[PDB]
Predict the structure of Histone-arginine methyltransferase CARM1.
Amino acid sequence: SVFSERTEESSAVQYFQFYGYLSQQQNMMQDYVRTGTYQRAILQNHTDFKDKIVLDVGCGSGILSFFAAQAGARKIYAVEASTMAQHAEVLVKSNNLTDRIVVIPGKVEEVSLPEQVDIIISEPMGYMLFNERMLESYLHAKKYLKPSGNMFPTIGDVHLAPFTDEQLYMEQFTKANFWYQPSFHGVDLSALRGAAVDEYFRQPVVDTFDIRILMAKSVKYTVNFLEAKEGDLHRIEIPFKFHMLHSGLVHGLAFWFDVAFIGSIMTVWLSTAPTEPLTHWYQVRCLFQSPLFAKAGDTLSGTCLLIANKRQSYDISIVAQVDQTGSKSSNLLDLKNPFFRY
Amino acid sequence: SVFSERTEESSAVQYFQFYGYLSQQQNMMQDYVRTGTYQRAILQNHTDFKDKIVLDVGCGSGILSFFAAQAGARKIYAVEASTMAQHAEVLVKSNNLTDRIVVIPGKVEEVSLPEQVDIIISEPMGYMLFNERMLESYLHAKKYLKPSGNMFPTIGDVHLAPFTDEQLYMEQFTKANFWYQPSFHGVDLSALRGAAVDEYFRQPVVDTFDIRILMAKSVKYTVNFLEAKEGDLHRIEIPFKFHMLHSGLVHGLAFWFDVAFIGSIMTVWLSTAPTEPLTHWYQVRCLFQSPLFAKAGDTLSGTCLLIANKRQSYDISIVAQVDQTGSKSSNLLDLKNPFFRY
Ligand SMILES: NCCCN(CCCNc1ncccn1)C[C@H]1O[C@@H](n2cnc3c(N)ncnc32)[C@H](O)[C@@H]1O
Ligand SMILES: NCCCN(CCCNc1ncccn1)C[C@H]1O[C@@H](n2cnc3c(N)ncnc32)[C@H](O)[C@@H]1O
């Protein structure tokens, strides 16, 4: 299928084993911003669900399907590929909703639905929005969407902004300099120092931060889920031209994201911005191995290219330059292996 | 090969990817008790290495191979299956030891060695000794061992003892009881409570503790690496009969291990006991889902059975009973996915 074609088997095995744990579902359920905002978006747009047909893509515990049932849905197909499906089925029986929620085990790229749906709901966002490549499954699910059907969430915005954080930058060399020792128990390790540095800088940094580190207004890249095709996410090119609001050393780019549920009654936003309450997505920072000096009023221009790989993630390429000086920095990160710094 | 036949491919992929990171090698090398004790064992038994042939099983960075070279070895074959092999070769060239240390990339079950060896050295101990199933690779390497050849380490002792720790039990139980909620955002989760508790209680707890929690003298199970066959580790049965020294609630069993390097000059011990300075193995505790009340002078009898699985780990069954009352507890733990509590 489409999923098997884009995913190495080892990665899929690990991924669905991970999501088969109740502790992981629980971790996501306990994110109050996430769960509360989803419930609110669904219940306050009750006309988009009352007596409607719903598809829940990757239902996990089934929480969103139960929210759709609370809003009056007639029939909800809840698709889930990990062993969590079995758990979801138990919940459906214990909440007396067997006539309204049908759990379907398997991948949404491989299962069958008995009918087309009025609305698709899902929680397909990973770190930096795109991690885990679940958005593609979400977009794939539009083969089951009736003409003029809706999607919750409806659109996604990724934000990027340059930051300064001298201590974060320094920590990488401090860790790597373990190898810059000529007699570790009699062994000269120094020839690996460079490799160590490289390894640490290929990891995106997952945590939160004070907004005062941001040096320019963010640039936005938008995916409209009603319109986008799976193939649009294999190569994501984000050009940027920042007008520097503060002078300093740019140590890298920070990323966050919002999604919007565009309903008939109201639009509801779920934001992971550093100006908003913390979520379990935090924010993501990609460091430059060579920082760039910038003056307030200078322009920092370049490109962030995200190239989808078969490990359900992206290879990140960031090229940036300060236009007033021509000083450049290029960087390659592996989004599959972030550094959880919180 | 033997390795591929006993190992799922997804697990092997993840395992060797994990050991390909310099940060992980660094973490293990920085355990000074481990590294220092290995160097001491090898250097103080220099006659076991001087002008000898050595096989280093899973050399990683190559540190033990460098130790063997310091002790005067003539030739060291250092076998490594992750990409760390490449890094090891770098070090071998930068320490001017190309004439003595030969890095051989691949699994020790699959490579070819040009000659038989006088001594096999390795660091094959995981959490609770047996995790990672690396001991079997170590034992497999005995196909290259000359008659009357030695192994470093030479023997392993696993220790088990009953413990009381109300706070640990309560912390796990509280995490599980999220799934006892009858109205999580209006949804009844309580039918999964039993599942939740099972999941949480099958993760062994990796951390250290004060020895005052131990309620009886430890029982010892010994594996002699000079004598054991690979097959002996597929099913490890450890019967136990504890004489309770203190009254209270037995919340589970604590595990640690020692290894001995039995050399021609002296025997050197590396201990992970809670009475000894801390190592990065810590100690491991398997909790009982239902604790057992015991009085001082009672006998707590049963069996710990470890069944090797294809995920490079073991399914652990612990059955224990207080003989004086017939109170029993049965437990299944998944050693592959511990809870790292430190
Ligand atoms: N709301 C219900 C839980 C939604 N889960 C959200 C994960 C993203 N969350 C997150 N949070 C913090 C940091 C990073 N990421 C994802 C769930 O979708 C399931 N699945 C993923 N692909 C699937 C596929 N192609 N076919 C069927 N099922 C699929 C998956 O097995 C998981 O159970
Ligand atoms: N000191 C030297 C580094 C030794 N590494 C020690 C592991 C210690 N485990 C542990 N666990 C918890 C806490 C602390 N330590 C293990 C290394 O052996 C490598 N490997 C594993 N199987 C192999 C195979 N069948 N054939 C070839 N290579 C093999 C592995 O790739 C790793 O690099």
